[PDB]
Short mmCIF file of C-alpha atoms and ligand atoms in Angstrom, two decimals:
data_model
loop_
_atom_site.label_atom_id
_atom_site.label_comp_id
_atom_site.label_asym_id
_atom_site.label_seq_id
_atom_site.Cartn_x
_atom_site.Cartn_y
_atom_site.Cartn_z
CA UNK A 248 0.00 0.00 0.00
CA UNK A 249 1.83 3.38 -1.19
CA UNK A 250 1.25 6.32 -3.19
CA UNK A 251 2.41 6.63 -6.86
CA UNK A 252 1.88 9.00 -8.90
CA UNK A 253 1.10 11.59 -9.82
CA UNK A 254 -0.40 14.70 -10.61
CA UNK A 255 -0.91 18.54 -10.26
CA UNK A 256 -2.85 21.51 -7.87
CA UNK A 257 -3.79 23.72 -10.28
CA UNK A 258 -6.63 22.72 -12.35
CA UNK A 259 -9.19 22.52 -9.22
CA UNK A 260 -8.65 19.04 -9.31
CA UNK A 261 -6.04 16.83 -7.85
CA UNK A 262 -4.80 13.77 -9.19
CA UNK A 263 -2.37 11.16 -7.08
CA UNK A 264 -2.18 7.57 -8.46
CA UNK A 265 -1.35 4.59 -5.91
CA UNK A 266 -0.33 1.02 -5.73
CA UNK A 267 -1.43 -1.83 -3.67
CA UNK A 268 -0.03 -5.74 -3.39
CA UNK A 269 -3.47 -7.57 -2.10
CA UNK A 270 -3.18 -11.41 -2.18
CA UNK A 271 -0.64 -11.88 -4.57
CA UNK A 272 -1.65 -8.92 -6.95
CA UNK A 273 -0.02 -5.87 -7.53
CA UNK A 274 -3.29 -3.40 -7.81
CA UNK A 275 -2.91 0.31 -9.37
CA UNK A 276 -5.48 3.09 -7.98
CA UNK A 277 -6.08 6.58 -8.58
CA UNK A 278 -7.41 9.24 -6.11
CA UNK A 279 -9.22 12.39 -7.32
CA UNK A 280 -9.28 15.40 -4.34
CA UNK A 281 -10.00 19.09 -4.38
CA UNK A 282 -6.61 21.28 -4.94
CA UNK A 283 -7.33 23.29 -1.83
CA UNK A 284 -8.18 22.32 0.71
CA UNK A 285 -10.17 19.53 2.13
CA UNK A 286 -12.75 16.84 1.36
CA UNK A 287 -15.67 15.26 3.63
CA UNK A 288 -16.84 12.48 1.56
CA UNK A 289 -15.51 10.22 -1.14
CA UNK A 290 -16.92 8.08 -3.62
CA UNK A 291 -15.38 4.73 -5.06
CA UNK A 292 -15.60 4.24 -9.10
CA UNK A 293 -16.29 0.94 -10.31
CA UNK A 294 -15.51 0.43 -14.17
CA UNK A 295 -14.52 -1.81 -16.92
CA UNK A 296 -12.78 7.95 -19.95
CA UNK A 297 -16.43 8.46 -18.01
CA UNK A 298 -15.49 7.40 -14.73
CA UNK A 299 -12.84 10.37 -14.87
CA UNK A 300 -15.80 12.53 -16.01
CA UNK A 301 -17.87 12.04 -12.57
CA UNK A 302 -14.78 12.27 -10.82
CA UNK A 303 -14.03 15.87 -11.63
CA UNK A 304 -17.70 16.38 -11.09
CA UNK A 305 -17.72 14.97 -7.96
CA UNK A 306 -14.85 16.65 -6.64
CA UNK A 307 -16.44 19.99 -7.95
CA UNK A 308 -19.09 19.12 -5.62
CA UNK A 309 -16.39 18.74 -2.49
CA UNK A 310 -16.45 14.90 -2.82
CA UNK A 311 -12.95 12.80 -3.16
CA UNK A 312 -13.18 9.87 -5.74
CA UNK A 313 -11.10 6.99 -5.88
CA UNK A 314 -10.65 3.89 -8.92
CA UNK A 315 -8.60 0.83 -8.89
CA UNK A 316 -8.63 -1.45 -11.84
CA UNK A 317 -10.55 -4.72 -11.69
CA UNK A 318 -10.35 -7.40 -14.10
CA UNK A 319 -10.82 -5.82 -16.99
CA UNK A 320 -17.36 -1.03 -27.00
CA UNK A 321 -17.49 -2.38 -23.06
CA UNK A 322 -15.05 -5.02 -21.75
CA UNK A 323 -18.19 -7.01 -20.67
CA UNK A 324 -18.93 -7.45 -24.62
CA UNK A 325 -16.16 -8.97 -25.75
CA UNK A 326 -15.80 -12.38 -26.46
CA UNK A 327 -12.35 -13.18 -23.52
CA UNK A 328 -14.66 -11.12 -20.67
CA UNK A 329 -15.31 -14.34 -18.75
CA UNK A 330 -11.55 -16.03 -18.42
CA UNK A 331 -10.33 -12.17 -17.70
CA UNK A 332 -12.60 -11.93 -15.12
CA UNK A 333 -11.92 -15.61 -13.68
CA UNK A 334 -8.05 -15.05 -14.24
CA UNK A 335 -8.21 -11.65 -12.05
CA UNK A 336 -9.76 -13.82 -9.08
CA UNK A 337 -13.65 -12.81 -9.61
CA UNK A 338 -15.69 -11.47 -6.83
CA UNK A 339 -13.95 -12.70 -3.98
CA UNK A 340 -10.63 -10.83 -5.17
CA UNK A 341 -12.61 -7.89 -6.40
CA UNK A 342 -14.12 -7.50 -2.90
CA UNK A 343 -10.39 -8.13 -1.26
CA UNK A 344 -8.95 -5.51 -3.33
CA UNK A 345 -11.58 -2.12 -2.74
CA UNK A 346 -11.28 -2.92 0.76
CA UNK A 347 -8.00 -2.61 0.86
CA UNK A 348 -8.26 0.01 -1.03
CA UNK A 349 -10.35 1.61 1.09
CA UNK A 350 -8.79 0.89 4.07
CA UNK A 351 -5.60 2.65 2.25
CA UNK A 352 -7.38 5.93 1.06
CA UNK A 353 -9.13 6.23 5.32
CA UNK A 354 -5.55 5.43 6.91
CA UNK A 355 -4.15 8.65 4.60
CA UNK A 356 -7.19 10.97 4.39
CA UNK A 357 -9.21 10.14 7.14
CA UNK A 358 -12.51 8.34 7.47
CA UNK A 359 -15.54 9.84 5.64
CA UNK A 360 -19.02 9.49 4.58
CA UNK A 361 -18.46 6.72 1.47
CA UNK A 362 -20.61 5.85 -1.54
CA UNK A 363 -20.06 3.82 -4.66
CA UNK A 364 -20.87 4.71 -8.27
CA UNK A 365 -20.32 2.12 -11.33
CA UNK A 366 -22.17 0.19 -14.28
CA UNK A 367 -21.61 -2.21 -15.95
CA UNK A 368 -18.25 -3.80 -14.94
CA UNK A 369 -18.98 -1.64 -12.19
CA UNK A 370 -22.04 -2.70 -11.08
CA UNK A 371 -20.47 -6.31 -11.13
CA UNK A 372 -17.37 -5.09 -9.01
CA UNK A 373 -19.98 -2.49 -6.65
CA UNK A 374 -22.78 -4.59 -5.91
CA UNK A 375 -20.88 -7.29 -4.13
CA UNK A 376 -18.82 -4.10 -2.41
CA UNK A 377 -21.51 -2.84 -0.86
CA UNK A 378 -22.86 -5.79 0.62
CA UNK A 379 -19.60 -6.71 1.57
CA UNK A 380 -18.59 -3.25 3.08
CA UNK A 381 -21.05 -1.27 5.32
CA UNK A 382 -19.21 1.98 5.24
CA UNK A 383 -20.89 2.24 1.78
CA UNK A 384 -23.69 4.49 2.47
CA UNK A 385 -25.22 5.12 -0.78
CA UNK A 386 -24.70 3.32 -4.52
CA UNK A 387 -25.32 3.88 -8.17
CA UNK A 388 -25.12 1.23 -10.27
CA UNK A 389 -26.46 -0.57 -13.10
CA UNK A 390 -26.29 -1.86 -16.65
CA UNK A 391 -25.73 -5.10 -15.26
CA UNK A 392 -28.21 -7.72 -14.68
CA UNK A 393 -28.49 -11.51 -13.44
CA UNK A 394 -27.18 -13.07 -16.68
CA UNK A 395 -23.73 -11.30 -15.95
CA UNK A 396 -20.39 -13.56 -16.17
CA UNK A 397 -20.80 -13.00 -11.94
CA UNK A 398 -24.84 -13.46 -12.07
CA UNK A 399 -24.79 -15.94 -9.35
CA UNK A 400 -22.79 -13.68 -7.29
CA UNK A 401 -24.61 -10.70 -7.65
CA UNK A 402 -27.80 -12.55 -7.26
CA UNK A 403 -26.60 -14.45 -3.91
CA UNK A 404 -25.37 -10.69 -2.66
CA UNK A 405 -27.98 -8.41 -3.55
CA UNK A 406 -30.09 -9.68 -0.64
CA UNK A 407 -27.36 -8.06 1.53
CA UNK A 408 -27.36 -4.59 -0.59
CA UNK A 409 -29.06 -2.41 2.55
CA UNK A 410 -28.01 1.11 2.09
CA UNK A 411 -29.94 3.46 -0.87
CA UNK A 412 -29.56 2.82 -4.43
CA UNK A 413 -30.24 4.45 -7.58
CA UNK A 414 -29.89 1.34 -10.69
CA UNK A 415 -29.56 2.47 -13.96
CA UNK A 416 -30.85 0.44 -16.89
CA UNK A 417 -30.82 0.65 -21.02
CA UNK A 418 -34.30 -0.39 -22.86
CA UNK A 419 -32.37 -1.18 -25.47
CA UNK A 420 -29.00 -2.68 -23.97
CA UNK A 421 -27.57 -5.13 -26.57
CA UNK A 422 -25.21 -6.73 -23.64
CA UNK A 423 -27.90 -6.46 -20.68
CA UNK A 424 -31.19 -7.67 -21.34
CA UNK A 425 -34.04 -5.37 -19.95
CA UNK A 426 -35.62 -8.26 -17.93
CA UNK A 427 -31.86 -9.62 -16.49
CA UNK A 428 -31.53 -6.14 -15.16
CA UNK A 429 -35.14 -6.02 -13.57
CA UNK A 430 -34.39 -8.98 -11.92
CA UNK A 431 -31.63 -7.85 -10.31
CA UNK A 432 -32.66 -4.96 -8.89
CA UNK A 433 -35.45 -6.79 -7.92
CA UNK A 434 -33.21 -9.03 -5.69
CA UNK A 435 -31.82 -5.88 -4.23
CA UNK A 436 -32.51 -5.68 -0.26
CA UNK A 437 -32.81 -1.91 0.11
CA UNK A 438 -36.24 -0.60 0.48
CA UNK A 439 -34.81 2.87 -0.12
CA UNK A 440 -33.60 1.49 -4.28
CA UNK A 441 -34.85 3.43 -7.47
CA UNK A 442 -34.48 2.40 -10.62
CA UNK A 443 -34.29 4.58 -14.14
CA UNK A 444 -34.66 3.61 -17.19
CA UNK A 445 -33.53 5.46 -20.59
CA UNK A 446 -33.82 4.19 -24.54
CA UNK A 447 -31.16 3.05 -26.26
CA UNK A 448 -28.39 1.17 -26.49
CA UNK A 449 -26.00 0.40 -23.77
CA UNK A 450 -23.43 2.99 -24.49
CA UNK A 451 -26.12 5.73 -24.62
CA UNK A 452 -27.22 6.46 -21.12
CA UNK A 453 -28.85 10.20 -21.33
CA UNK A 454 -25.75 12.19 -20.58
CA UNK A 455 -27.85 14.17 -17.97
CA UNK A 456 -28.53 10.87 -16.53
CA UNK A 457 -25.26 9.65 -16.33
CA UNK A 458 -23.09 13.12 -15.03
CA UNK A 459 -25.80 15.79 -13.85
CA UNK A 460 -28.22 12.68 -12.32
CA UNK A 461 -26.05 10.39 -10.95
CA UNK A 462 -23.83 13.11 -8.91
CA UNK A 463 -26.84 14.93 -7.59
CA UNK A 464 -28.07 11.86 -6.33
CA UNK A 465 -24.85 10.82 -4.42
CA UNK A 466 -24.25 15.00 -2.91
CA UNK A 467 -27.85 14.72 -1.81
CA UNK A 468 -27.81 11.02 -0.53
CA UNK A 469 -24.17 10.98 0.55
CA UNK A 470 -24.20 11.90 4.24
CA UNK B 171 -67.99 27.52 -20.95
CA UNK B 172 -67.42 30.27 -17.83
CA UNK B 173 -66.07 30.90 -14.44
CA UNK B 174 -67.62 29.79 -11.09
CA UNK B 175 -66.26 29.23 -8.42
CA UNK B 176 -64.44 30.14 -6.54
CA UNK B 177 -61.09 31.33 -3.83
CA UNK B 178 -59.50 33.82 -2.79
CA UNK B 179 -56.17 36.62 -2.76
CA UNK B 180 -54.31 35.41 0.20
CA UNK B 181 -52.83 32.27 0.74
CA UNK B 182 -50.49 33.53 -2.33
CA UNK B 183 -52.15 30.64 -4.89
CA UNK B 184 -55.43 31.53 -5.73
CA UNK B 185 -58.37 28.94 -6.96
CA UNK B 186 -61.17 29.84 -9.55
CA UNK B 187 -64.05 27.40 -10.41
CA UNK B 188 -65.25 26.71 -13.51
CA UNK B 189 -67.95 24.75 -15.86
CA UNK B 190 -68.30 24.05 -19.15
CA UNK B 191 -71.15 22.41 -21.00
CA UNK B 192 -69.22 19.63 -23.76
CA UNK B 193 -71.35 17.33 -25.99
CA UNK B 194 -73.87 16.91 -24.15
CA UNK B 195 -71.75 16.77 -20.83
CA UNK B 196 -71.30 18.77 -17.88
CA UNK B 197 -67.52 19.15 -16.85
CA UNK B 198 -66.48 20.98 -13.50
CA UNK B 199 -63.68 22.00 -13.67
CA UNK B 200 -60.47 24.26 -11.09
CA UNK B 201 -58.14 26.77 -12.23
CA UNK B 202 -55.12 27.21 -9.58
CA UNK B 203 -53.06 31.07 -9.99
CA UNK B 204 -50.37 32.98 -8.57
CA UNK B 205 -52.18 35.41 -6.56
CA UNK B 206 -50.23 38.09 -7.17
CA UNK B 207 -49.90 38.46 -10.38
CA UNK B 208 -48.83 36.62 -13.52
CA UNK B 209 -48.12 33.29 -14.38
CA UNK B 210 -46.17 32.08 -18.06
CA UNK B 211 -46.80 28.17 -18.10
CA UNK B 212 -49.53 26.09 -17.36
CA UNK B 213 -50.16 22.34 -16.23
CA UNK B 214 -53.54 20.24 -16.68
CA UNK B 215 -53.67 17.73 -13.79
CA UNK B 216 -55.53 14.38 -14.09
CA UNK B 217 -56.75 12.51 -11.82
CA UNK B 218 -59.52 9.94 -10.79
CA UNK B 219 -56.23 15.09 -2.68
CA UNK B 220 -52.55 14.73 -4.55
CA UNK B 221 -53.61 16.67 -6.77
CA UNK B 222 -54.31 19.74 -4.84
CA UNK B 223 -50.60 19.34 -3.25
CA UNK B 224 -49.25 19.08 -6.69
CA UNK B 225 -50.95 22.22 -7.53
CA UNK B 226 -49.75 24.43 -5.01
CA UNK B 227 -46.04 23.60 -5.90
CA UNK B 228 -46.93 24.14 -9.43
CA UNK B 229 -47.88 27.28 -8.17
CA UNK B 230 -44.86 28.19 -6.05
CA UNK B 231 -42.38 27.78 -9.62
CA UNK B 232 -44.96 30.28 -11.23
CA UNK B 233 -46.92 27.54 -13.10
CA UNK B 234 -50.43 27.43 -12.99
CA UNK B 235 -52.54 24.63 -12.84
CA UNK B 236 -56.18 22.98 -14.31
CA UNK B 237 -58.07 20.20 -13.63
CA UNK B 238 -61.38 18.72 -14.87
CA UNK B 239 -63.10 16.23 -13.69
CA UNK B 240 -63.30 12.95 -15.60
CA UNK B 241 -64.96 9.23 -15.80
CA UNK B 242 -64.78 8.86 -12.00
CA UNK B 243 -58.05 3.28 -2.56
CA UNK B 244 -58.08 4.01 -6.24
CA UNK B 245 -61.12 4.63 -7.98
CA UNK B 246 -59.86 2.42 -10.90
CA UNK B 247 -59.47 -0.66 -8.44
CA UNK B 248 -63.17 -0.37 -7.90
CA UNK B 249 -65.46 -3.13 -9.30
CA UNK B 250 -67.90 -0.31 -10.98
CA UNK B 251 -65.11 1.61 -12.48
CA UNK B 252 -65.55 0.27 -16.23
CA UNK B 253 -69.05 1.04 -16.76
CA UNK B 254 -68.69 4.22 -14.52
CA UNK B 255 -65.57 5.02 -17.36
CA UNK B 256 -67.88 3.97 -20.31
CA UNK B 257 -70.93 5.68 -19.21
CA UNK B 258 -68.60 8.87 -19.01
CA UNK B 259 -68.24 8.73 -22.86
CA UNK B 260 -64.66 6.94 -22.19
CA UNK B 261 -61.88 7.97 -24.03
CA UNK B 262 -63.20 9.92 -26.60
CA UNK B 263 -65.43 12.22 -24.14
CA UNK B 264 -62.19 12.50 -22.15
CA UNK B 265 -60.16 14.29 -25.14
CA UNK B 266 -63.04 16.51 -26.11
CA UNK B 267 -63.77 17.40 -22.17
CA UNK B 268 -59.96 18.62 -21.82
CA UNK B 269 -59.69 19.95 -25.53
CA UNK B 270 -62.32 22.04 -24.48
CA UNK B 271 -60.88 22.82 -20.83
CA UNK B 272 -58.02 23.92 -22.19
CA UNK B 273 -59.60 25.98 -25.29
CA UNK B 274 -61.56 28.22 -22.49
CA UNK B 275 -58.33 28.78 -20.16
CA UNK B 276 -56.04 29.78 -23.87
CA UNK B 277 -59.32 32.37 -24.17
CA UNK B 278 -59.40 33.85 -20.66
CA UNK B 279 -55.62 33.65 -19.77
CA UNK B 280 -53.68 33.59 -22.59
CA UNK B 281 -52.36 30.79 -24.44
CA UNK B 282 -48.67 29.30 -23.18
CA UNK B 283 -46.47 26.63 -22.60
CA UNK B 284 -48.31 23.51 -21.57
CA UNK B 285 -47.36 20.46 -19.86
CA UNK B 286 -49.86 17.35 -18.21
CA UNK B 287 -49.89 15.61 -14.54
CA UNK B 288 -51.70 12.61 -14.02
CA UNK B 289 -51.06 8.85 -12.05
CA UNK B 290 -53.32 6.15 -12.98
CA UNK B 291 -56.77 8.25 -14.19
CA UNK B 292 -54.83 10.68 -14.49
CA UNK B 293 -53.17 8.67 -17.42
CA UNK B 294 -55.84 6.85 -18.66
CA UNK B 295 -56.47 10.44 -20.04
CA UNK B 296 -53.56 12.04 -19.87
CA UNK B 297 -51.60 9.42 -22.44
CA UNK B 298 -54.51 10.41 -25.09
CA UNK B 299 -55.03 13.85 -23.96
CA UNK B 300 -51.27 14.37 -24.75
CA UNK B 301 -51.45 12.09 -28.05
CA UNK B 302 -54.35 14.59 -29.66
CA UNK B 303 -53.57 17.91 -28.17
CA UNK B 304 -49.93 18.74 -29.45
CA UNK B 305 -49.96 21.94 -27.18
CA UNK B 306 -49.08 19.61 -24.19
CA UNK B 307 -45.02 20.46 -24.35
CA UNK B 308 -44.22 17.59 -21.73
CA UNK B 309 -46.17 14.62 -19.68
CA UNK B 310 -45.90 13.42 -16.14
CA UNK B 311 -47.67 9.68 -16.16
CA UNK B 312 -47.65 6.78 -14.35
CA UNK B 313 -49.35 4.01 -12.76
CA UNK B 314 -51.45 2.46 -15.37
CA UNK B 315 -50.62 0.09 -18.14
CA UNK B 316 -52.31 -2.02 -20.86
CA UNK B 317 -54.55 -4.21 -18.65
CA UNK B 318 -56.14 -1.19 -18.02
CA UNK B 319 -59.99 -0.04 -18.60
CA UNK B 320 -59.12 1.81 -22.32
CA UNK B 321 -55.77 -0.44 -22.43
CA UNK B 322 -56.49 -0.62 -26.26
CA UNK B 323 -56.92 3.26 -26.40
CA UNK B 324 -53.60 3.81 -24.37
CA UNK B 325 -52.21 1.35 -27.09
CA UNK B 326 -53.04 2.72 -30.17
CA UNK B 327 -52.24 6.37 -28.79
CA UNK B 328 -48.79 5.86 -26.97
CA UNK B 329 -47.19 6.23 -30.75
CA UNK B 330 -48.83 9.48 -30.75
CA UNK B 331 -47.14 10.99 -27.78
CA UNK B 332 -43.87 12.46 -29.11
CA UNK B 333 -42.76 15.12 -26.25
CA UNK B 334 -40.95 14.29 -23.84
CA UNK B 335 -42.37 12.30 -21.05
CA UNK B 336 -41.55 10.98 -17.24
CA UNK B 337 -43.30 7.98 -16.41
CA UNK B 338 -44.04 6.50 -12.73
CA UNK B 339 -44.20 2.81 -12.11
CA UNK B 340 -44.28 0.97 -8.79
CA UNK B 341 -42.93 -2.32 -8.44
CA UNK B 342 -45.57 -4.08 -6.09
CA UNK B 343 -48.49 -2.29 -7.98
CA UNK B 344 -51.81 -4.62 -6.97
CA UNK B 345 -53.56 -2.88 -9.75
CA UNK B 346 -51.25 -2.63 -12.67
CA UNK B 347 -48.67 -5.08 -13.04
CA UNK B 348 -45.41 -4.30 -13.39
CA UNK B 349 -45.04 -5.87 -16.96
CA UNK B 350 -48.26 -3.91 -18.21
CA UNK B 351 -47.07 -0.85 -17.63
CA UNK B 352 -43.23 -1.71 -18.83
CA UNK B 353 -45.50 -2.20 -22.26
CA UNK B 354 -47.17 0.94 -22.06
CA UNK B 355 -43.79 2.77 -21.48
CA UNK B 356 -42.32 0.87 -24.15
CA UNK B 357 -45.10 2.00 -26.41
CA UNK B 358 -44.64 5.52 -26.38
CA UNK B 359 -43.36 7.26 -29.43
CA UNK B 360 -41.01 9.82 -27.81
CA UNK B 361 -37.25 8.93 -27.63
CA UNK B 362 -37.47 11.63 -24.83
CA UNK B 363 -38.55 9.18 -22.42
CA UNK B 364 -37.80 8.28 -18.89
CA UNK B 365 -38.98 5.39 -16.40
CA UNK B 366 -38.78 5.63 -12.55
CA UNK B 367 -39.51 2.88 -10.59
CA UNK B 368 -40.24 2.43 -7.06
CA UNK B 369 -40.63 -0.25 -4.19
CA UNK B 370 -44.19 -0.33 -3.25
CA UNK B 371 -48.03 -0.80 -3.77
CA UNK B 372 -50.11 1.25 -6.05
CA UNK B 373 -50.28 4.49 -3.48
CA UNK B 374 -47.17 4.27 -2.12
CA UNK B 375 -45.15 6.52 -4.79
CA UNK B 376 -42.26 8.23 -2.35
CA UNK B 377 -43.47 11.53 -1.67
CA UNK B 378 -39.97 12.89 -2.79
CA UNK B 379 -41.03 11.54 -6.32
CA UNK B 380 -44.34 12.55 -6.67
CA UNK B 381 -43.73 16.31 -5.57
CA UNK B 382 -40.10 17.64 -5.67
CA UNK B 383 -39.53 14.85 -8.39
CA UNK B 384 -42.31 15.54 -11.02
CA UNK B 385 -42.47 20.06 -10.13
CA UNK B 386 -38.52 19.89 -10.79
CA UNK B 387 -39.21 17.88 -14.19
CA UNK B 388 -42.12 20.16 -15.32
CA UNK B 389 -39.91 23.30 -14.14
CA UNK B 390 -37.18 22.22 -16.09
CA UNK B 391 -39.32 20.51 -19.12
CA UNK B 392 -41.76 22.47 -19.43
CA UNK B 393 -41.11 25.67 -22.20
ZN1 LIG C 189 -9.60 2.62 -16.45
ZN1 LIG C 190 -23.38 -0.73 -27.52
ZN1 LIG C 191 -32.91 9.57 -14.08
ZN1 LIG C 192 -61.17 15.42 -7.66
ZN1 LIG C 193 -53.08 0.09 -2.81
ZN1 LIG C 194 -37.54 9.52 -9.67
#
């Protein structure tokens, strides 16, 4: 677990990349903060170029964000997704390496108020996150559904999903049938769980969905 | 067609009755105003109490508001409500009625932007209302689907609807299935769509979704 690296104070936001060695795996991370000064909350992004988007968002909003890579045109449509995944450890090691990541990012900055935001690959990666790890508060997620390469996970762990969700689904998702995805959220615990759904195709959430949407919801719900 | 009535000045939203003789027909009708002193948008509200609240918000963002009543614990759950809807003139009554509505308010208040409000009833008309009047800009719906009493009206006239359009659905809905109304969403012609669904029986909508949620769309929707 160490810091490396790295990147500049001015614009507004700050950009420090990090390392971890979790279980055998070497596991790169980067944390977004405001330049000056401090930060209350933080959010963890799950993916599989957008999740850098809601990061500067985020942090424009006084929120920290924080990535590490998992096993990873979406990763989770191509033809090798399933060994990658397997080869990177699945769930278990996915769930291993954000809370050590985690851990990592409170031991530096401090202990805050912490939510999760990802689809897709990140929805695969967040939903068994947050019902692993309580000190997720709040999580968006979505364009993922039970038919996923980790559908048996994510339908054995959704149960234990208890903190407020917004779910995100495409009509018209090629890779994510609409009915998969209902019957995930479905299996979702939370009483306090919404779920949108937007036309299209999986690459076209409504970009007000996806930036404007998604980090109101957290700054609202993130407390 | 003419006033009566009818509220008062202070509290600042003021409420005018109304009547109008349609077809044979005798519609009552509301008119909710700004009481001091000019208002630029307008929303008809359908219904079959909420709609009073909604109203008053409506109000408070500078929109004003009318309702008429139609065909009319839901009412549409009711084992009389299909020959109380037909003996109403159904569907077709139900466009005139509000064509007409609407026709007296453009006369007396000025013609301007125009949006609709209405759950369940409220979108049994609202979906054609909003099909055959294109001076309705944007539509709140919700709760209702193709089982429904004019399912094959709602049917044939989602194509029609081409502005944009929120639509409610509750997950444990005892009087419209969750799959109906997926169809009926999936129906509607408008790419500028959006579907929000919620845990919970037929009148248990979150209150942060059926007032802040809807006003802020119509604020923000509605020129
Ligand atoms: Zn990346
Ligand atoms: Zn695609
Ligand atoms: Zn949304
Ligand atoms: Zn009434
Ligand atoms: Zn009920
Ligand atoms: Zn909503």
């Amino acid at each position: 677990m160490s810091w490396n690296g790295k990147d500049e104070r001015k614009l507004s936001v700050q950009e420090r990349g990090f390392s971890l060695e979790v279980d055998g795996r070497t596991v790169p991370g980067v944390y977004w903060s405001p330049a000056e000064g401090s930060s209350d909350r933080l959010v963890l992004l799950g993916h599989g170029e957008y999740i850098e988007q809601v990061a500067k968002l985020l942090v424009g909003r006084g929120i920290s964000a924080m990535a590490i890579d998992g096993p990873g045109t979406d990763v989770v449509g191509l033809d090798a997704f399933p060994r990658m995944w397997h080869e990177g450890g699945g769930t278990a090691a996915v769930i291993a390496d954000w809370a050590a990541a985690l851990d990592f990012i409170e031991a530096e900055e401090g202990p805050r108020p912490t939510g999760w935001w990802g689809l897709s690959m990140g929805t695969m990666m967040g939903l068994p996150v947050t019902a692993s790890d309580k000190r997720i508060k709040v999580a968006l997620l979505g364009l993922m559904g039970v038919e996923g390469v980790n559908g048996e996970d994510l339908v054995r762990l959704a149960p234990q999903v208890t903190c407020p969700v917004r779910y995100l689904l495409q009509w018209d998702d090629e890779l994510v049938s609409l009915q998969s995805g209902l019957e995930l959220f479905g299996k979702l615990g939370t009483k306090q769980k919404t779920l949108h759904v937007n036309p299209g195709k999986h690459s076209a959430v409504p970009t007000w969905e996806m930036f404007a949407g998604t980090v109101d919801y957290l700054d609202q719900r993130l407390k």
